[PDB]
Design a protein around this nucleic acid. Structure first.
Lengths: 150, 150, 128, 113, 64, 154
RNA sequence: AUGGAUAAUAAUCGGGCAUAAGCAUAUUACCGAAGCUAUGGAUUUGCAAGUUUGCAAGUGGUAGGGGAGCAUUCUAACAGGGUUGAAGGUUUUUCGUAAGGAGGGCUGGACUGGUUAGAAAAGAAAAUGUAGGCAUAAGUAACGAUAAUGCGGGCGAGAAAC
RNA sequence: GAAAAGAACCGUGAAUAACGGAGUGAAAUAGAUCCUGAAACCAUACGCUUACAAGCGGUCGGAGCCCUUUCGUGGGGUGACGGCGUGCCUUUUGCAUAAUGAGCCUACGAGUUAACGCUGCUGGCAAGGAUAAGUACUUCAGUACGGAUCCGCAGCGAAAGCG
RNA sequence: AAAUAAGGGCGUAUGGGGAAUGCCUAGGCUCUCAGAGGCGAUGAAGGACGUGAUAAGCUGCGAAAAGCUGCGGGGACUGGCA
């Protein structure tokens, strides 16, 4: 209502008074929160991630495998279910080109689109894509118009 | 704020009434008589006994020379009287001790059944142990009490 | 409270006759020995005791009593002095600001020496 | 901003030191000696409260025994015959009667005997 | 600054589709002539990182 | 501990001195040492979504609309800056001794200068409105012309 | 029950002491804990009514884990107090489970602070911790080559040392 | 101290050492050790106890004697006498330990921040969510724009690839 | 005059001691905006010695020595801290 009656939602604010090492009675006092002596109770202790106590860790007992292809072509991936849900709420009519994929945030500006076949597309569409699957092409060309590869 | 409203009244020095009991120790065992004498001296046969006040009576044992021990204790009872110097532990006997001031038997028997405090050292001054058959108090009018009526 | 009113109420020293000796270069523990012989005595027995005391802390304490007597005579101008029969009501020997000096002890160390002072206060009172 | 708890730092210890009033030596003015003595005093005061309830019962029992042995009885027999008679008077009231009202005490004794 | 991913753990330990970490088996390096074909066939398929090591592997791969 | 003007030299020997071991006078527990875990130059700004921000600015208008603290003028204009004239036109509206926020649609430098000296009135253009500015005042005065920009911006 | 050696500062049923107040069996009454119960009150989970009450099970605690809060310094809004006496210091009364809040007298002579929200140089009893002040040992060690001093005059309030 | 108006003058004192007066001031118990001025520490006066009584000095009971009083199964002070009771911290299976540490008081003193993440609560939008650098205006360390880019929506395989 | 237990303990009051706390600022810290980034052989930075009606220090100034001249501003006090 006013600047003197500000009240947040119930559960958004918390204690903010919890400090470690403030006398016995507030919980964490004396040996603040690190128990008794040891390496884990000294100032500046940091857990070595790969360290396993001294023995060989799992990230060093397991062999390496595989390589990476420099010319890997990864497509976006659009399903017939998503295409039908996009043609129901009318934004595309009889033509789904590479522009209706950018206007609807389905693919970036300079990428490659591959139409997959997970769905039950029923409407007749004329799609233009880079690649098709054996299911998507057979479900488009039979249940509607053509499917051109660009 | 004194929220009790019902307190246990304790006797004071201005309310106690001390008597002058006289006890005949002709036929009596040492400890069997000393227990009752110490109880009378402390004061526990009055329904006004306060543990921190010098209540009770004054006892006058009038036949201490005629006391007896049961077994061969008159010949096998030892009293240790260490002096404080190296090798200064003296040992007496019940037969030798009663040859000089036979009242010491009853005196040391009674002293030992007392609270061993300032009140308990002030109670020993109320006990009069006479070796003969007549005391020297005179104008106090003491009454005789048989220890078998308690 | 009004400070002028509090001061005018506390300025009741127009009757009591007292004397003070501040910043005396003597220790308080050595003057408290001679103050005990004077505390409570008559104003002339105290003078005799201070004049014949075998202590150096009495040469300057015997004239503080004379100054107190003179202050009493100034305050009670109307009246003689021997008819009143003065005595020593209260006499207090307090501490004072001490000086700190250094003494070189053996093997390259230094010890501290505190030259102590003391304050003396005396009030007379009268028998009448 | 710089926050210093200077006033309340000493106002907190003044209250804990004001209850060490009457202690011998420096246990009443020195802070680290008074605090160590006030906490032990409170520890002693927590107990002795369970002992005040069993040190008064002993006195009541002793006074009842003294008042009952004047009539040729004992505390054990008197309490037995009282409890197995439907009386239900606590030892506090019984000792108060034995001390202040011997007529009432002997009346109770003759009724239960 | 930005948490660096451990290279020894990033060259191994491929992350699966939903929540698991896929790795390879050991002991199949240079003494394979005396081990039974059953062991060599079992140690060929990829395995999953156990739940006791999953926390350490995820801390190494910078997926807390 | 590092910025204190001193020297990083051990004060006393390690052993044989009888006192506590120490050195490097710039340590925090000495008189004149560094302040351990003290303040640092910081920035206290955090991020809120510009959808939540406009939702809050809309709620701030709805609160005033519910409390009935909204007036509308006809976009007056002053020839010369006059605090006297600006105070003269405050009782016709009833904002005397009350906190008012005049929301203009245009610069109106004269009207701003005629209220730069008052503490019970604030002239703010629509291009600089804020949730805090709306909540601070006690009565909004939206000039005819500023509503067209306030409505078609949320 | 009896004999079968005992260790060095004075010893032991804990002591007095007991011929039963020792031992064996049986019975009764009583004493005896923060155990159980009687009375008053507080709190945690689970179940219902509502917007605190009722019932059930609980409520020792180190390392450790969780939840509600107090004080301190400053800031944003609204509402205040003060030379007819603010902060601070010293006593006293009262309230709360506690950290703490409020009121009165004395000194003091100019600032202070309620409600909601926010931030942190946000709380000491110990680190042979640091700086300042002040005690104890105590009127004690010592007053620094065992070459040596005595008397009479002088100044002077004051002289073993001039 | 608002301003030196910083104590003329008199007395004790050998003394221009100190003090008591007298004047200045609202204050001199604001007097140059100068605002208020606590604690440790050192003393004086008054009330109650204490010279036959053994120990972490307290606690629970308890007379007697002094002040106050709404008059009281009210308050304050001291307490003769009785019961119980071997400080604190740290390290340890285990410390009164004769294991460590501190003479006391006052002041300082130890889990804080930045970047990148993860869990619990809360909020906006929602198959979508969010901007970074920067730019424009302005009453200027303080609304609009900016979609580059990041996460999610499809995974498997070392990879070609399939989906 | 009084009191008196040689002395000690507790409570209250009044003193000395000390500098904490409270309030204040002469000084510092981190920065924003706009400039500038050098002095010196026509003798630098940094000093020594001198200079006053009176002059121990600090400040200013150099044997023309708490100062000299020219152009503007200013209008009653001035001979630095003093």
């Amino acid at each position: 209502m006013n600047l003197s009656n500000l009240q947040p939602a119930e559960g958004s604010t918390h204690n903010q008074n919890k400090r470690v090492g403030r006398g016995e009675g507030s919980g964490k006092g004396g040996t603040a929160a690190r128990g008794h002596k040891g390496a884990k109770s000294r100032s500046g202790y940091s857990k070595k991630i790969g360290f396993e106590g001294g023995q060989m860790p799992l990230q060093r007992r397991v062999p390496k495998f595989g390589f990476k292809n420099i010319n890997r072509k990864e497509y976006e991936g659009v399903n017939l279910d998503t295409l039908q849900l996009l043609v129901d709420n009318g934004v595309i009519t009889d033509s789904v080109s590479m522009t209706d994929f950018v206007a609807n945030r389905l693919a970036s500006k300079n990428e490659i689109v591959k139409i997959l076949g997970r769905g039950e597309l029923k409407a007749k569409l004329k799609v233009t894509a880079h690649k098709f699957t054996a299911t998507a092409k057979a479900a488009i060309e039979a249940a509607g118009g053509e499917a051109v590869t660009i | 704020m004194d929220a009790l409203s019902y307190k246990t009244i304790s006797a004071s020095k201005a309310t106690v009434t001390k008597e002058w009991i006289v006890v005949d120790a002709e036929g009596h065992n040492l400890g069997r008589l000393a227990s009752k004498v110490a109880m009378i001296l402390r004061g526990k046969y009055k329904p006004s006994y306060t543990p921190h006040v010098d209540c009770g009576d004054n006892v006058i044992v009038i036949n201490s020379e005629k006391i007896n021990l049961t077994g061969t204790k008159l010949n096998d009872k030892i009293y240790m009287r260490h002096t404080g110097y190296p090798g200064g532990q003296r040992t007496l006997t019940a037969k030798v001790l009663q040859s000089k001031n036979p009242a010491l038997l009853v005196e040391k028997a009674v002293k030992g059944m007392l609270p061993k405090n300032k009140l308990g050292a002030e109670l020993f001054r109320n006990l009069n142990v006479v070796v003969g058959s007549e005391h020297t108090h005179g104008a106090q009018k003491p009454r005789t009490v048989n220890l078998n009526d308690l | 409270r009004k400070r002028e009113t509090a001061d005018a109420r506390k300025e009741a020293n127009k009757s009591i006759a007292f004397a003070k000796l501040n910043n005396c270069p003597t220790s308080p523990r050595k003057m408290r020995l001679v103050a005990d012989l004077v505390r409570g005595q008559k104003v002339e027995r105290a003078l005799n005791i201070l004049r014949f005391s075998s202590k150096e802390a009495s040469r300057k304490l015997e004239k503080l009593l004379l100054s107190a007597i003179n202050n009493w005579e100034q305050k009670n101008s109307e009246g003689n002095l021997e008819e009143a029969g003065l005595f020593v009501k209260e006499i207090r020997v307090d501490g004072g600001m001490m000086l700190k000096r250094l003494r070189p002890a053996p093997q390259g160390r230094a010890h501290r020496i505190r030259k102590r002072s003391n304050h003396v206060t005396i009030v007379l009172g009268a028998i009448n | 901003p710089r926050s210093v708890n200077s006033v309340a730092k000493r106002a907190r210890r003044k209250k804990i030191m004001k209850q060490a009033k009457g202690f011998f030596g420096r246990r009443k003015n020195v802070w680290t000696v008074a605090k160590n003595a006030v906490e032990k005093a409170m520890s002693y005061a927590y107990r002795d409260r369970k002992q005040n309830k069993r040190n008064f019962r002993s006195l009541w029992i002793q006074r009842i025994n003294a008042g009952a042995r004047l009539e040729g009885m004992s505390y054990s027999q008197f309490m037995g015959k009282v409890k197995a008679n439907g009386i239900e008077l606590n030892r506090k009231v019984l000792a108060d009667l034995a001390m202040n009202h011997p007529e009432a005490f002997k009346a109770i004794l003759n009724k239960v005997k | 600054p930005k948490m660096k991913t451990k290279s020894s753990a990033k060259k191994r330990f491929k992350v699966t589709g939903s929540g698991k970490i896929k790795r390879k088996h050991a002991f199949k390096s240079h003494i394979l002539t005396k081990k039974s074909k059953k062991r060599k066939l079992a140690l060929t398929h990829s395995a999953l990182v156990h739940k006791t090591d999953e926390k350490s592997i995820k801390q190494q791969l910078r997926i807390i | 501990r590092a910025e204190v003007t001193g020297s990083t030299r051990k004060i006393k020997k390690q052993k044989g001195t009888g006192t506590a071991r120490a050195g490097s006078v710039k340590n925090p527990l000495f008189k004149g040492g560094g302040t351990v875990f003290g303040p640092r130059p910081r920035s206290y700004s955090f991020k809120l979504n510009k959808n939540l921000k406009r939702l809050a600015r809309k709620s701030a208008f709805s609160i005033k609309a519910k409390e009935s603290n909204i007036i509308v003028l006809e976009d007056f204009n002053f020839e010369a800056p006059n605090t006297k004239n600006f105070i003269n036109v405050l009782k016709a509206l009833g904002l005397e001794n009350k906190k008012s926020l005049f929301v203009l649609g245009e610069s109106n430098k004269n009207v701003y200068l005629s209220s730069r000296n008052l503490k019970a009135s604030n002239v703010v253009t629509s291009s600089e409105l804020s949730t805090y500015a709306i909540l601070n005042t006690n009565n909004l005065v939206l000039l005819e012309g500023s509503l067209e920009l306030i409505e078609e911006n949320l």
